[PDB]
């Protein structure tokens, strides 16, 4: 069943560039919907920043 198995077809990571994140998605809470940034179960701890993406925020874990 769920947890550690979640498939997010349509959400490739920004940290490592992996296709459609597996296990749990990490939806950026403060970065805008136009960007809609994402991290893997490991990458969500990486605390990354771009031109828009910053460490000023938090991420949301998605178990489904």
């Amino acid at each position: 069943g769920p947890l550690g198995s979640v498939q997010h077809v349509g959400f490739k990571c920004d940290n490592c560039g992996i296709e459609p994140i597996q296990g749990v998605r990490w939806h950026c809470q403060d970065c805008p919907p136009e960007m809609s940034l994402d991290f893997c179960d490991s990458c969500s701890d990486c605390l990354h920043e771009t031109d828009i993406h910053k460490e000023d925020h938090q991420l949301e874990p998605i178990y489904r």
Binding site: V9, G10, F11, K12, C13, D14, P20, P33, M35, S36, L37, D38
Partner: peptide, 8 residues
């Protein structure tokens, strides 16, 4: 990154 496709 939202690669998620949708209708026009």
């Amino acid at each position: 990154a939202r690669t998620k496709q949708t209708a026009r």
